[PDB]
Paper text:
The base of the spike domain, the P1 subdomain, shares some sequence conservation between ANV strains while a hypervariable region, forming the P2 subdomain, is at the spike domain apex.
To prevent potential proteolysis from occurring in the ARM by trypsin-like proteases, we designed the [name] ΔARM construct wherein residues 2–45 are deleted. However, we continued to observe a smaller ORF1 band accumulating below the 62 kDa marker during purification, confirming the proteolysis was not limited to the ARM region. To identify the region of proteolysis, we generated polyclonal antibodies to peptides from the jelly roll domain at the extreme N-terminus (residues 46–58) and the C-terminal domain at the C-terminus (residues 635–672) of the [name] ΔARM construct and confirmed the presence of the N-terminal peptide of the [name] ΔARM fragment and the absence of the C-terminal peptide by western blot analysis. EM analysis of the [name] ΔARM fragment showed that the particles formed were more homogeneous and symmetric in morphology relative to the particles formed by full-length ORF1.
Numbering used by the authors:
A (entry chain b): 169 to 504
B (entry chain 0), C (entry chain J): 55 to 544
The structure:
Amino acid sequence: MQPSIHLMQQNKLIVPSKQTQKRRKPYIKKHISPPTQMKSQWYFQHNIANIPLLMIRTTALTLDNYYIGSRQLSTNVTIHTLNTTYIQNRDWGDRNKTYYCQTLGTQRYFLYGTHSTAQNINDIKLQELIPLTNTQDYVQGFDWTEKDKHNITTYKEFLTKGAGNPFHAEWITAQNPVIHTANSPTQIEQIYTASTTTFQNKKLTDLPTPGYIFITPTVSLRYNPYKDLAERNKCYFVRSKINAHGWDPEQHQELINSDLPQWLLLFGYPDYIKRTQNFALVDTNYILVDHCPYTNPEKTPFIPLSTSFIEGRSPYSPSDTHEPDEEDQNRWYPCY
Amino acid sequence: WQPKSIRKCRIKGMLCLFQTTEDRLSYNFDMYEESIIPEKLPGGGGFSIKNISLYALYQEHIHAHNIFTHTNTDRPLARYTGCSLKFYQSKDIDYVVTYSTSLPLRSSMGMYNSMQPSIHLMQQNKLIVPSKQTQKRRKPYIKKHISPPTQMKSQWYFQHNIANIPLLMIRTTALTLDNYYIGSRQLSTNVTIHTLNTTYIQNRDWGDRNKTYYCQTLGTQRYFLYGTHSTAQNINDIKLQELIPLTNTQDYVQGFDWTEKDKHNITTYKEFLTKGAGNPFHAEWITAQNPVIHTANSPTQIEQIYTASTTTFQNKKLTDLPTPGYIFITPTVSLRYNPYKDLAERNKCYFVRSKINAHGWDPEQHQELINSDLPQWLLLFGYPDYIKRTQNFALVDTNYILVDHCPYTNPEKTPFIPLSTSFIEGRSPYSPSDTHEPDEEDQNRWYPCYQYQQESINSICLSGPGTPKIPKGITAEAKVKYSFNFKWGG
Amino acid sequence: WQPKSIRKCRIKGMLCLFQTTEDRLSYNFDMYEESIIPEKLPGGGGFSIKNISLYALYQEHIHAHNIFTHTNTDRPLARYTGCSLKFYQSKDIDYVVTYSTSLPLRSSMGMYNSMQPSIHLMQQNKLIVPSKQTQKRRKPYIKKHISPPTQMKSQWYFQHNIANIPLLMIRTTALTLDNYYIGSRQLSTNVTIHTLNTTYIQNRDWGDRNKTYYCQTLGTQRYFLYGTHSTAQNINDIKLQELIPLTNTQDYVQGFDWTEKDKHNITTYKEFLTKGAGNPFHAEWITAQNPVIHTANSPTQIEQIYTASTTTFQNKKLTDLPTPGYIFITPTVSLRYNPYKDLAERNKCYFVRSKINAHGWDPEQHQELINSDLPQWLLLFGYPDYIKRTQNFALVDTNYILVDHCPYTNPEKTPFIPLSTSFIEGRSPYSPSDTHEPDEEDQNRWYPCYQYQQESINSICLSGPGTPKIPKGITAEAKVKYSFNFKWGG
């Protein structure tokens, strides 16, 4: 149905716009025969009521700006994506359950935001970090120094109230430094239950497991349809409401596409899935994924992210509403 | 002796000829669509060279831009009959086309020079495509039948035997029949060209933290440029503490005075030269907005002086340097040029390496890569892209730079040397006004180099007749529909 | 621009298409006439692939099978016009023909599969030649004119420049339009196939006097087959002295009991295994006419036992071996198969090396040499000869063996493994009944190998539709007269 492949289809009909071309009569008229199965005999009411008589396929295009619009700075489209090398947990949307980016073996890993001005990773103080500990909540978090502001008496209240959104505008893009580690905040729980005021001498390296890496949640890929083909690229849906890792299909192997380049391959695929499979919620229940080796920055599996979600704004609100709307305050997680 | 089974087969698809813009007016498109163009950087080209081959058509079908009327599977025999081209009218730009079917179909230096639109119209057997704005036709396309190449006879051939042989070569470029000799807001034809001041900037070795930059070397003595904030017009009273030497390139750093010693943790003047170094090409020094003094100082002399005593500079004057000569010399000058006042009695252009510690602007690479007998606005057109496609130099964009000789400017220097306005005003290329500083990527490449010639040589081309002066920030498309007739067999 | 002197020249001669027989029904003839076929061994083939070239015609003239109307001496220029073929009717067999003149004329795996007569008739642009018995025509030959290859134009060429280029490719096979789905004495369609019992015979390393043969190796334990003459059905009371181990292959030896110690000058049980070894594939053990017991004995255990004491075996029982398990396992089983009950939902066939000490019947040589989606009676047809001509393996006949997978037999084993009736009944191939023992030459090759698959895979092909079931011991000829038109020049 994508227009550029649609024109190649035989027995087509183009309708030039009045701006593109001025015709003598502003309409194209044709006679269409009945379906070849339906003979020219008589039938009852409510016996041919639901039988289709004519099926119309239409799409929009522009014969003038075929390969490029006008203000289009370039063809060179930027695609935001989840950093799938470290964000592998598909279970979001729970106040009670903390969010771990990935689980290697039986150890969970977490992302921590900090405001440290020192580039060293070992001197960053444990008080300054702002753990995620949740999703679905567009909350930016705050430092341990803000203990008095939110009526905090213990670090448990800090994690319940001072939790920050990993996907928040100040952390999704890594505008502020964010550190991935194997901290397992239960370790900090034990440390401050032993003594919470002793954190003045607690350093980032004192955690039982080493590894403190600046890992951004999302990266901006650069892509180009003229440089992209279809030697192996593929796309499909995966559930977003399960506590399982990996981005492989587990739902329906009949709902995998492949042998077209990305700009064609994506076209109409979500709506097709909506109409054919009738999944639980489609929009809210799960998410779409693809595999494309033809981007400048490439990750075996990919994962779109609208610019609105990356810049911290509700969808389809261009610039005026800089914060997520009232309705989506309880759904701000990677979702269709 | 026709084969047993034949099947008529057509190939129908839309081919995007070029997407051009003001900042990308005179570059070859078809070598840029294969390569990824970074976002927020205008690309494309105002002219394209097409070598349509059967393997190229199959590759296009892989990208899903065309269809086959009948598949060629298990029919190795092939037979070519001819092609039909439908040139669609662009909405707001004008393009002319021409096609050839000779034996070699090898692009040459003369062909790319002749690709410039005003000389392209003079070429015989042309075809103009008026834009819808320029003229409203009955049918918004020009259709013609093109015979196969005259060498390729009408016999049968194998698959992957005529795969790479060209069947049709298309030459296209953009123009504007209305604003032929001038755009509209074009204040005048009177184009300004920034150039390196080649009378004193003669060293071609940039891009080294360790090695200082000397503008020129006469005999065995090196000369250096120093920036100062002195408010006195006298050249002898300017204090030695106030000067800000260059001592480096490739670093967009503006420098600071000796009075700022405490700010950057400076204990010796060596730390001053390592940290307080300034870019000679910086926006506050390239244009000579602030005074800059050329001399034969040889900063090792100042090294000796302050190793003797650094605090004694309160009584050290500019004239105390062992070698005299302190001249206000701007790094770059703005020439005024006019294509109607310029001819081709001796002008010439060529490339020279930018990564060697040698002086002079003469060619030393390839005497076969010199052009001459056309005026500048024609002579430059497509010349860089020609060099990219033909010679395959090391990096082209980064390895070296282009130079010309033109006696027809108001201010004239035997050899010249473009400089895009972006590089002169201290901004990354193709960023119009918002990003006033060089980007993150080019912080380690801010030296005179081909990635900073772009807009200047493009404007030199643009000043010539027939250039499509479109509004800034808009992109113009040009689509062509191709129908190749084939007959698979076997 | 015709040459100065031309001379019309024809080439007339008789070409023997194939001489087939029941035991040689589905092999390519034209690769066997070049090689010497030993006397008293039927040869030929039921189908032939012909690549008639000018050099081939000259070679035929060297053998004096044709004539030239006019000599080509001192006339290097050549011109081809066309060929006329006269297909003579065979006396008592039916053959169909087809011809192609494409560019490559390279035989493929699909072509040789499609060569089987019942699928060959379905091919378009065919030609049937009824036998004189089947039908009496007015003129006992079919004559047609065949155009030159469509790539070869009607221009002039040099000698030894078109010498090796094919001019005409002939595909032929034998059939019988009368007995299409069944012969005559054919008791039934219900063909019996002997096969190696692959559930326990899994070792592919045969043909070594020094190395003993183990049927299979589970983990690190080897299993062996033992023949005995015990008249008691109990498996635990069978005495250890009565067993006759294999301990070798490639030797058609039946073995003997420990009681025959004196006959062969045996002093120790090592001499018993060196001399009293028996062939597991021998006529009295392959079919399990005499009981044979599979076990995990590992004869080194018996070595230890008799080195401790050899005369104490009077009290040694079969159960005293360190590892239990004594199963009556026949080396080969007779499957029943039917082409009308067999399809192609998953069946497959391929070759595997027979001269390696490795287990399993999976392919490890070439995944490009697997066939599948045809029923067995088609799938096997011409496949060995195709492999001979295309891959040029080490020895084909002796180096390795063929295997298939077919779930459609009454008794079914994931992988299968033909075995000609001759090898199962202990006789040399192609010797019907007179020579009851393997010949002198094959005394040192009597192991499962391609030289013993012949009649079985041939019978599998024969069971299919359209096979010319001729009487045993008769040979059928098929002669074709070819007339090539040429024009020498110079």
